């Protein structure tokens, strides 16, 4: 049975050198973004990403769109731990279900990212499926107008994966990434949503999987593997503990201050 210190030692020995990371809304609330367990007028949290409610009333979803359209929110320490993981040549890939875009803003290259639940850089008509590039609807959204298709009149929607829609093709990189991974990090996600959650199962059986979350629930709780490790608590604090045990608190402070100075 492994410790969180044990894990950091693996990294410092470089015994773990192709690290893949699944993250969720956990890691972005320290920045101001809502996680949908909670102000927004929905009959229940999930309707913001459901197609029937979206057609009935797209207004809450476009409220959240307007909040997230960039430059409002900054990345916090969890993002920069991922960016530094990259900078140190350790990040094989970072799989996210967030649509706040701060993984990019922290300086992680699109190359190293899989925005598994979509992006705002593109939109699709809800009825005729004509694609449009992002900015072409952005202004509409920033002025509380609902954008419609100039072909069929359909509401056109940002390319956010709702419940019932397929995941983006870039997600299929997991078929290549997970069997190469020597360490899985799960950061700030209750893993409530498939097929994303199922990825925890797709690393090799000797691969350590470290959860830094509030709760230990779902797949990792049910069918756990010997070299699993859970740092339960507030995600930021857990990360900062890992960082100190790594040696990186100092250059972490430097990186955060440098970047937050840039922005």
């Amino acid at each position: 049975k492994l410790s969180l210190q044990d894990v950091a030692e693996l990294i410092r020995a470089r015994a773990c050198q192709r690290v893949v990371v699944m993250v969720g809304a956990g890691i972005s609330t320290p920045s101001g973004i809502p996680d949908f367990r909670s102000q927004y007028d929905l009959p229940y949290p999930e309707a913001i990403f459901e197609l029937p409610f979206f057609f009935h009333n797209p207004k809450p979803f476009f409220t959240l769109a307007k909040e997230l359209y960039p430059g409002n929110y900054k990345p916090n320490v969890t993002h920069y731990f991922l960016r530094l993981l990259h900078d140190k040549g350790l990040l094989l890939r970072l799989y996210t279900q967030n649509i706040d875009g701060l993984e990019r803003v922290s300086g992680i290259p699109a190359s190293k990212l899989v925005e598994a639940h979509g992006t705002f850089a593109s939109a699709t008509c809800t009825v005729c499926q004509r694609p449009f590039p992002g900015e072409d609807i952005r202004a509409d959204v920033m002025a509380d107008r609902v954008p419609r298709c100039p072909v069929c009149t359909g509401v056109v929607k940002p390319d956010i994966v709702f419940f019932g829609e397929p995941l983006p093709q870039r997600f299929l990189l997991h078929v290549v990434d997970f069997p190469m991974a020597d360490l899985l990090l799960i950061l700030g996600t209750s893993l409530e949503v498939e097929p994303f959650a199922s990825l925890t199962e797709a690393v090799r059986s000797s691969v350590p999987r470290l959860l830094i979350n509030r709760d230990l629930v779902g797949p990792l709780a049910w069918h756990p593997r010997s070299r699993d490790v859970a740092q339960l608590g507030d995600v930021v604090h857990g990360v900062e503990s890992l960082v100190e045990l790594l040696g990186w608190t100092e250059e972490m402070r430097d990186l955060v201050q440098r970047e937050t100075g840039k922005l």
């Binding site: 709702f162 419940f163 829609e165 995941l167 949503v193 498939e194 097929p195």
Partner: peptide
């Protein structure tokens, strides 16, 4: 790793 559309995990 599973396939399919985005959906709720079965408890």
């Amino acid at each position: 790793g599973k396939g399919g559309a985005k959906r709720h995990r079965k408890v």
